[PDB]
Amino acid sequence: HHHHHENLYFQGVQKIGILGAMREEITPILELFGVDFEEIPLGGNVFHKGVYHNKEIIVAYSKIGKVHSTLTTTSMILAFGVQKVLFSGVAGSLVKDLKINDLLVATQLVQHDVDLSAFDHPLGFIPESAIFIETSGSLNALAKKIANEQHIALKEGVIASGDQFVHSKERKEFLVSEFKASAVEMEGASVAFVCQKFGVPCCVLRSISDNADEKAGMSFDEFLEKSAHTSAKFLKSMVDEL
Amino acid sequence: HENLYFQGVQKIGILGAMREEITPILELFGVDFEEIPLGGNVFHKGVYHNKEIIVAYSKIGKVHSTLTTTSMILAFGVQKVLFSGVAGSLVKDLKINDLLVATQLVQHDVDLSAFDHPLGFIPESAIFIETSGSLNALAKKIANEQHIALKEGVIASGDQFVHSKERKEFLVSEFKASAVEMEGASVAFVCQKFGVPCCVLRSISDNADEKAGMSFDEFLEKSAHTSAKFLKSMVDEL
Numbered sequence: 001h002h003h004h005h006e007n008l009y010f011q012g013v014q015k016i017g018i019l020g021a022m023r024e025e026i027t028p029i030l031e032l033f034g035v036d037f038e039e040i041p042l043g044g045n046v047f048h049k050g051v052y053h054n055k056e057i058i059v060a061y062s063k064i065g066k067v068h069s070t071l072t073t074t075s076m077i078l079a080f081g082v083q084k085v086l087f088s089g090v091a092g093s094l095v096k097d098l099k100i101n102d103l104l105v106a107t108q109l110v111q112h113d114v115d116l117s118a119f120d121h122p123l124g125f126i127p128e129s130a131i132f133i134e135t136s137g138s139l140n141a142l143a144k145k146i147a148n149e150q151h152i153a154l155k156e157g158v159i160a161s162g163d164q165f166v167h168s169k170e171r172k173e174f175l176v177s178e179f180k181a182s183a184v185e186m187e188g189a190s191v192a193f194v195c196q197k198f199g200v201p202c203c204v205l206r207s208i209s210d211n212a213d214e215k216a217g218m219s220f221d222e223f224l225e226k227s228a229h230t231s232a233k234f235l236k237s238m239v240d241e242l
Numbered sequence: 243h244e245n246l247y248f249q250g251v252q253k254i255g256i257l258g259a260m261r262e263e264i265t266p267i268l269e270l271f272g273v274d275f276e277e278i279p280l281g282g283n284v285f286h287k288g289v290y291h292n293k294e295i296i297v298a299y300s301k302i303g304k305v306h307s308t309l310t311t312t313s314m315i316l317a318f319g320v321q322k323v324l325f326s327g328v329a330g331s332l333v334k335d336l337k338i339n340d341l342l343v344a345t346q347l348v349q350h351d352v353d354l355s356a357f358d359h360p361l362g363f364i365p366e367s368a369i370f371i372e373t374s375g376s377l378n379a380l381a382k383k384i385a386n387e388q389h390i391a392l393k394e395g396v397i398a399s400g401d402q403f404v405h406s407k408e409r410k411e412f413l414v415s416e417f418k419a420s421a422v423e424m425e426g427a428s429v430a431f432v433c434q435k436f437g438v439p440c441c442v443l444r445s446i447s448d449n450a451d452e453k454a455g456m457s458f459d460e461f462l463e464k465s466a467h468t469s470a471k472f473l474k475s476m477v478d479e480l
């Protein structure tokens with residue numbers, strides 16, 4: 001909107017957490033934002049703290065897996081006071097219509113490798129918790145709105161996360177039947193989980209790097225950079241609208 | 243010789259994974275506890291020997307235990323963490339009710355072998371996670387004075403309950419683990435990342451085999467109690 005007198009309108013600094021798993025998922029994010037970054041070490045992570053328009057952005061890569069990503073997200077929330085968290089990186093596709101480089105937002109997430117079935121618990125379920133973790137409706141709808149306005153496809157679906165790289169037809173088919181998941185990665189569920197426990201709105205974005213079959217290693221290696229960029233670009237376009 | 247040791251305000255974090263693992267701890271300390279909720283956990287804050295003690299159960303598995311430990315450290319400033327609870331035995335010499343402290347821990351369900359990494363390993367990390375040589379030495383001294391046995395060994399942690407011969411054998415061959423549970427590794431990991439001395443203490447509840455579910459169910463209370471008593475006696479000496 002037009003602001004004739006800028007002093008009449010709110011200028012308070014909104015704090016946003018931006019997470020990737022690997023350095024390569026955040027390099028494109030650092031560049032696209034294109035501002036100066038103070039680097040703050042904590043809990044074995046490097047937090048990149050910068051100012052971008054009305055917003056304090058805190059950018060880090062967690063390192064791979066649930067423990068890493070759980071710790072980092074908890075640090076963003078508790079040590080940097082972030083009020084929103086946006087995750088960007090790559091994932092493996094489990095569905096034919098999600099192709100290499102395609103984007104998706106997780107409506108729900110599950111830890112696919114959790115197994116308490118010995119006490120009759122469904123796979124993915126833990127007492128005092130739930131199978132499916134929710135994300136922010138606000139941010140997910142924002143996501144669909146920018147996708148539609150920029151004329152780019154955006155799937156929304158269930159993301160499965162676990163502490164294994166998936167690269168076989170059998171594990172894929174398990175994730176589809178057990179969870180109706182559209183993609184697979186190693187941090188999503190944990191990040192969304194933490195945010196839900198602290199009441200912090202969370203959006204999980206992923207660009208497809210492979211198909212989670214026996215070729216996945218090679219496909220992941222080939223498409224990491226591009227898929228990372230494609231996710232980072234879309235995340236920035238979300239932050240610009242925030 | 244107090245004057246020679248640390249003189250400031252001590253704060254000690256005390257963790258179980260399940261409520262049943264901390265109920266006996268709370269009871270043993272006997273002091274009054276302020277309940278403080280944060281990030282879906284309830285932290286029980288009390289004073290004993292003029293140290294603050296912060297007790298919580300994390301809920302089950304890596305994500306839960308990682309969050310809770312990080313909250314303890316970042317929100318409550320705990321300077322050491324002692325974990326108490328139960329675990330499945332992977333070795334003949336560890337039988338029901340027996341105590342062990344973890345010398346090292348491993349996350350046994352981590353698998354990046356598709357990129358030729360050894361099982362348990364993640365880039366920019368390590369297969370094995372260390373614990374506090376001093377806290378463990380304290381546990382061992384206390385054990386010998388109370389004339390109770392205390393093994394030292396590797397504890398394997400993963401987000402599955404282990405109840406099969408096959409997985410047992412994998413844990414022994416791949417990591418030379420002595421016991422299995424679902425939180426120890428993640429707790430020790432966070433403490434390591436933050437430079438916080440950690441001791442992981444477990445009392446055996448089952449043999450991690452096809453009978454494990456039933457054994458765990460029967461022996462949870464007593465094994466948790468045994469662990470909790472021992473943790474208390476460690477805190478007594480801090």
Ligand SMILES: CCCCCCN(CO)Cc1c[nH]c2c(N)ncnc12
Pocket residue numbers: 021064065090091092164165166167184185186187209210211212213216220354357365
């Ligand atoms: C040693 C290097 C490892 C690559 C890390 C893969 N990331 C991890 O979060 C995401 C991911 C992309 N494709 C995947 C797949 N098929 N399974 C699991 N995770 C993924």
Ligand SMILES: CCCCCCN(CO)Cc1c[nH]c2c(N)ncnc12
Pocket residue numbers: 116119127259302303328329330402403404405422423424425447448449450451454458
């Ligand atoms: C409803 C499910 C309750 C099991 C909770 C398991 N606790 C660690 O959370 C300890 C444990 C004891 N024995 C075990 C075994 N064989 N495998 C994994 N973990 C363990």
Ligand SMILES: [Zn+2]
Pocket residue numbers: 460
């Ligand atoms: Zn019974």
